[PDB]
């Protein structure tokens, strides 16, 4: 389906499963699309849930607008979607950049919209190194990403999934060429301007205040060998700021562990959704 937001942007979404099922809403990372969740959507569908996933503005099949590439607009786009579908008691699961979108939307959501949230390999509290965050990554790492994306996006999108994203640069790791090709295809369908601008939106936005307002139970899951969103500056810190958080650490797993190790993660997600 599609949902039109307040500035006229059409957002594409998938909505599968029982109309009466408990809604599980998935928020993809950068620079991907709702199709990055195939495995988890089939999994949750098989357990009877209703599964919903949208393409962020400028990504996948959604429109490619000139503006709105920032976390507040992203969270507002989610609210347009959940209001259009009139979702109640949904579970929101966000990966990477999508975990920041989830944190901001759940902090601002209308009552009864959300029951639980899951932040997987997520960006909060804040990634960039600063006064307030001495353990963050320097701005130069993100300048690098911006410069390579602008210069030859198609090559940059082979390098990322080939190296750090799924940990395929680690000696002995089982490599899947299909995961590399699929990441590149999802990224090439989206907009160069949205992908370029989103880098600053995921790495420089402070979600500390958002996390402080979340009162529903939150599962915080992260792999310890994450080469994209450093584990120590994210997971433990987010868990400490949330009122009702469960922290799960997966030794040796990468940033895209939902696709490389779904047999480890999926049972832990279903347990939490059922608790």
């Amino acid at each position: 389906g599609t949902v039109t937001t307040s500035d006229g942007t059409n957002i594409f979404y998938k909505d599968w499963g029982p109309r009466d099922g408990l809604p599980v809403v998935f928020h993809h990372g950068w620079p991907l699309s709702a199709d990055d969740w195939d495995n988890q959507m089939l999994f949750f569908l098989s357990h009877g849930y209703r599964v919903i996933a949208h393409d962020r503005r400028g990504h996948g099949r959604s429109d490619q607008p000139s503006t709105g590439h920032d976390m507040d607009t992203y969270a507002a786009d989610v609210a347009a979607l959940t209001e259009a579908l009139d979702l109640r008691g949904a579970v929101h699961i966000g990966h990477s950049t999508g975990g920041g979108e989830v944190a901001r939307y759940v902090a601002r959501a209308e009552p009864g919209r959300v029951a639980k949230a899951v932040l997987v390999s997520a960006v909060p509290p804040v990634m960039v190194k600063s006064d307030t965050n001495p353990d963050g990554l320097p701005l130069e790492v993100f300048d690098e990403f911006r410069a390579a994306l602008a210069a030859n996006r198609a090559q940059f999108y082979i390098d990322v999934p080939s190296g750090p994203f799924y940990g395929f640069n680690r000696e002995g790791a089982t490599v899947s060429q299909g995961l590399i090709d699929h990441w590149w295809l999802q990224g090439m369908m989206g907009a160069a301007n949205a992908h370029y601008e989103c880098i600053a939106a995921f790495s420089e936005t402070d979600f500390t205040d958002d996390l402080k307002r979340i009162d529903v139970p939150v599962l915080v899951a992260h792999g310890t060998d994450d080469q994209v969103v450093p584990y120590a500056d994210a997971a433990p810190k987010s868990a400490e700021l949330l009122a009702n958080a469960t922290l799960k650490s997966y030794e040796g797993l990468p940033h895209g562990m939902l696709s490389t190790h779904p047999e480890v993660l999926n049972p832990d997600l279903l347990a939490f959704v059922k608790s």
Copy 2:
């Protein structure tokens, strides 16, 4: 263009060639799209035919609805398109799973809408082993496709076209990386739930009754080294059940022979459409 079906699903279709030419409609297999017919669409166009091809629901550029992944809905979606275009005297060509859709649509079509039909490498009568079909394939063959698709669809869709679909695993075959990569792209564009559910629809639906209902002339074509839809349980059985069928056997050709050997097949399809 697109056509809206009774449940509100939008179906993408192509319609090229003279508006008054005889219509030849192409039905793609699993898990592809209308783009699998490029070669045959240009070949028929060059002989002055009007050439139509749609993306099955949940495939290519069509919508990805929650339900309707079954042969009865697929044939009703075909009727929705042929009614919107008001086709008369059309020739329907179906490959693989599209051959099952053709058999069911043609058996139920309003009289005058169809002139002739062609089943290439098609699934009928019935693939799976049952009480009525002991030479069929065991269910476990299909349970493996389901499990590989659900675990890592992007890698499973490299594995199928690299191996059995086009016979590139046979010694001495001509391998085209282009055919592999195009199969993968068309597959990854479609929906994971549609592709998953379709496996039961193409392999367990019994088309025996549809086949007994068809009265127009039917060309049944099939490669004898078909590693996806086994030759002996399909083509000769279909031809024996159809009132007016012509059986064409192609020694040593694979399941995707319309793309690996179009120079052999195209003239034979053409002869049939002109007869």
Copy 3:
């Protein structure tokens, strides 16, 4: 965004940047899409311009109509778009086949619509060999393209970008696998019939009279080792026929130079637009 033309064809386009920015409109080459301009769009956006690029009919995300695959229609589709956006004083940049479409559009544009144009590695004045153009390429070259495209588009779309398009067949060239894969993707998304018919459109159309009617400043840029649109029969001839043209030759650069050497071409495009 999308605009519907007067024959009902939908054309997709992107429009990014300030609303009061001078409009720089990009016209991609054969058989590509608006996405071929990612580098140049982010570059001009970073200098405060509004940047616009559409998918030619039968290409990329635009519809795939039966007809209209000719330069007169391509220039009327551009007129339809610039009227809908109400562009005034735009700069039109065209690559390859897109440079012929820019010449035709600019020659017929309404008063006030165009300020300047840029023809990069463009097809004017006329490619095909004849009595009028003794240095053209023989019709046989384009007949081979037609034949390879119709036989196996998927494989021909790997061969073109792998050999001649980007000069990767030259000893010592730095090959980018992402450039190859992206060319192929953009090509496979477009229509086989449009791509096939466009070959005659770009190689056989004589743009001599179009060039003689253009009176705005025109930059004619061309690589001297262009293996798709030979330099000697294009750039110098176009520059002689234009009233106010600046010719820039790039020694040893390929047809795809905007993507292989953007650090060389982008400065020159910007200096032309600021002049």
